[PDB]
Amino acid sequence: ESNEVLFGIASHFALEGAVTGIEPYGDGHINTTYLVTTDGPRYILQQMNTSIFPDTVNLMRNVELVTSTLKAQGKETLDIVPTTSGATWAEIDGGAWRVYKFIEHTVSYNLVPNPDVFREAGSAFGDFQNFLSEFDASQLTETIAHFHDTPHRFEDFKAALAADKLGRAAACQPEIDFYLSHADQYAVVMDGLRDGSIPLRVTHNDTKLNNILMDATTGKARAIIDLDTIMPGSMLFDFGDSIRFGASTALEDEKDLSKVHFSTELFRAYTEGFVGELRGSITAREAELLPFSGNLLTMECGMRFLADYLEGDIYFATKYPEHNLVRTRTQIKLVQEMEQKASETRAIVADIMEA
Ligand SMILES: Nc1ncnc2c1ncn2[C@@H]1O[C@H](COP(=O)(O)OP(=O)(O)NP(=O)(O)O)[C@@H](O)[C@H]1O
Ligand SMILES: CC(=O)N[C@@H]1[C@@H](O)[C@H](O)[C@@H](CO)O[C@@H]1O
């Protein structure tokens, strides 16, 4: 948006300083995020993506419930800055906008620099699972249906493939055939949720590493952000998605595949932190599926990148025409290595579950 438009939006909110700038900020793919600089405090301004989250009222109800529950336990979280009339968000000229306080003195990572950082991530999301267990499913309505319903995602992928709107399929047959060949593997968690062998839990559902802000001095997790997808699911969605993003030796959009590897050392570090917090609640069946949850969420995310490529990049923000194909390729490479290391990761979980 133009400066005039953005400064107008900012005037709707109860900011505590004169605005000096509003500039696009961050590595988010979904909403449109801006850093608001003032003569004092900083803020994050977001235009919510209503094509992805059409029910803005229900989304903000969830975010308000979660954050207010955290605040009422004295725990740092996203602090909604209300409109000047007290609302949690504003509809302005056909757009939905919200503001959060900028969480100060933090660092975050798109790539794990050392195992200790990833262990801390495990602890943070493991702790968040315990926190979320205080809610029953009925209090937090789904903001996106079938969100980690991988067979449903696969139906969407197949439709995108058959349509082949842009004629992009010709150049990515190996990637396409990887997802088609693994069709048999996509239902394991959904089947377990449906038959009761996997507990339905309230989960975060987007547990990539850069959704944890860590303190710049202590290195400890300060807050979990990106709260839009909190809804019922399986623990395995949170665990798997964390491994997908954070157990890689490379960025999600690394162009050089020779740099992309699945690290069992990082897998171990995360699992130590995560299971360390959840040892009391994790069932036998959940533990059995911990390694495969990595494969599953990486395949789901990968297929979603490739479907989006085939559809002309309507879902995820991209920086260049082939960006989503570059992204799907890293996810495939990762899964190829998770398959190769399946015995090793099984052993890691068993070791941790005992000691
Ligand atoms: N309250 C905050 N304080 C400081 N930084 C923030 C805050 N909220 C968001 N950010 C930063 O802005 C980035 C994008 O925000 P986020 O809410 O993850 O965007 P999104 O597009 O809605 N979802 P995603 O594509 O999953 O990252 C984050 O990675 C952080 O760097
Ligand atoms: C609401 C939504 O679709 N969020 C997605 C998440 O599912 C996906 O795993 C990630 C990939 O980087 O990007 C976004 O955060």
Beta-sheet pairing, 212-215 with 95-101:
unpaired
Burial of 298-315, coded b for 16+ CB within 10 Å and e otherwise, reads: bbbbbbbbbbbbbbebeb
Closest C-alpha to 303, from 157, 158, 174, 147: 157
3-state secondary structure 23-36: EECCCCCCCEEEEE
Q: Where are the alpha helices (DSSP H) in 223-262?
A: 235-246
Ligand 2 mean position to 315 CA, how many Å?
Answer: 10
Q: Does residue 301's CB lie within 6 angstroms of at least one atom of ligand 2?
A: yes
> Which residue has the least CA distance to atom 7 on ligand 2?
206
Q: Does residue 308's CB lie within 6 angstroms of at least one atom of ligand 2?
A: no
Query: Concatenated DSSP letters for 24-75?
Result: E-SS-SSSEEEEEEESS--EEEEEE-TTT---HHHHHHHHHHHHHHHHTTT-
To 10 degrees, the CA torsion angle through 271, 78, 44, 117?
-20
Ligand 1 mean position to 335 CA, how many Å?
Answer: 26
Q: Does residue 29's CB lie within 6 angstroms of at least one atom of ligand 2?
A: yes
Ligand 1 mean position to 312 CA, how many Å?
Answer: 24
- CA of 105: how far to CAs of 18, 98, 217, in Å? 21, 22, 8
* SS3 call for 179: helix
PDB experimental method: X-ray
Residue with token string 């979990």: 224
3-state secondary structure 139-162: HCCCCCCCCCCHHHHHHHHHHHHH
> Which residue has the least CA distance to atom 26 on ligand 1?
28
Q: What is the DSSP letter of 185?
A: G
Please, what is the Cα angle at 309 between 304 and 315, to 5 degrees? 60
Give the domain CATH number at 260. 3.90.1200.10
Residue with token string 């439709």: 159
Could you tell me the residue range of the domain that residue 339 belongs to? 115-354
Q: Which helix (H) or strand (E) holds 290?
A: helix 284-311
User: Hey, which residues does 212 pair with through a beta bridge?
Assistant: 224
Give the ligand whose atoms come closest to the C-alpha of residue 76: 1
Return the structure tokens found at 311: 């559809």
